[PDB]
Symmetry: C3
């Protein structure tokens, strides 16, 4: 059901690695450093560091000829672990909160994407989140730009729970 | 020496998965619905590679996720391992502020169901686990989210994988 | 090219485990608890926890007869994963910053080690780092003491990016 092809070099050149399952460490046997990717069946969630840590990259089906094709930010060219991302959800519901522990101003998003949180009274601060239904991806900047943070069904009482160092988010969309 | 049986559904129904060693990713079973710990304790985790919310699993029966989890942060359980608790003594130092600063409390071979009984409020910002394995909780009487402290030093609440320094009770992991 | 020998007991006694590749868990049918280490060919980057998490220990070539020989901080006696560390760099360039997102006072270090950041206008605070060339290791206390944090070539916009809970650093050196 899932398949990703990772290449040692840019433009789908060099050593080729096909994966149909999660990989907690790409340097364990597979590649030295991922240069390009083809997602044949996904989506996949890729990570800058080993064991599904560090910066996140949602990889939909398609071609990524270089690291700047999957990184919407330019913080890191490292990709060391990745896994299939379960997106089997008919409805999407997300609650964003101004302050930690689901306190302060609240924004509810239902079966829609938000390219700018500013259009709904928020600033560039999201300090707790409730992903009621579906999988979502939040971004640092408007129009789905900068670093990505994935929200799967569950509660996030503080920005550290979604692996962010700061509560800055300016756009969010459903993974579908 | 260790053995856990995980079931796909609640009340020990559906597909089974027997483990006698750590598992960094349960992906084998779609979603754990119930657990029988035959020989433990085990330390279970909401996420892969021993990350996310923690659940200490002593020997016994857990017919549904709310039997092992006290919070609503997740029903997901994706990794788990045997927890070594072979320690004759237990010593824990709790600190008010990060980097072992401010008010200090020492706990020796005892459990504390309310930190408020010892002048601590609900703020623990650094910890020293001198001897033994401990488990701290958000609320008094060992309620809410759990955080395991194995022997070592924690200069900030993020070191024990907490987003905030709130703790109100703590106990030793022992039989 | 890489080789580490791990022993069950102190002073290179008990059961042995030889590794020439990364190991995400030393308790997964290898050893009960590492008591001593010989690095035959390195350097290696070791970790307190499984899956390359927790406190870091840079292990150069040589003999470590007890846990407190590799841990320059009486933090933990635990060592559960480790990997070879690539240090193939002819030059070393590091930029340290006072505040996150490469803001505030800046220190540039070129092909040199700094046993005290205080000797160059910093306090015990480093909140973002640019590792332009080479691999580096930062420490909590002056003279390379306390907990270690490895910096590989790349950008670190916040202290959490190098897996620190706080921006306290007082010395830094090249891994060579």
């Amino acid at each position: 059901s899932y398949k990703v092809i990772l290449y040692e070099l840019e433009n789908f050149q060099g050593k080729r690695c096909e994966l149909s399952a999660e990989c907690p460490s790409l340097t364990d046997s597979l590649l030295e450093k991922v240069g390009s990717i083809q997602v044949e069946s996904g989506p996949w969630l890729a990570f800058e560091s080993r064991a599904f840590r560090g910066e996140q990259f949602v990889l939909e089906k398609g071609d990524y000829p270089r690291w700047d094709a999957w990184s919407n930010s330019r913080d890191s060219d490292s990709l060391l672990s990745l896994r299939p991302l379960n997106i089997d959800s008919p409805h999407h519901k997300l609650h964003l909160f101004e302050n930690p522990a689901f306190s302060g101003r609240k924004m509810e998003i239902v079966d829609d994407d938000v390219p700018s949180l500013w259009a709904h009274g928020f600033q560039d601060r999201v300090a707790s989140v409730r992903a009621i239904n579906g999988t979502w991806v939040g971004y640092e900047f408007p129009g789905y730009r900068g670093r990505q943070y994935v929200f799967e069904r569950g509660e996030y009482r503080h920005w550290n729970e979604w692996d962010a160092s700061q509560p800055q988010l300016q756009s969010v969309r459903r993974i579908r």
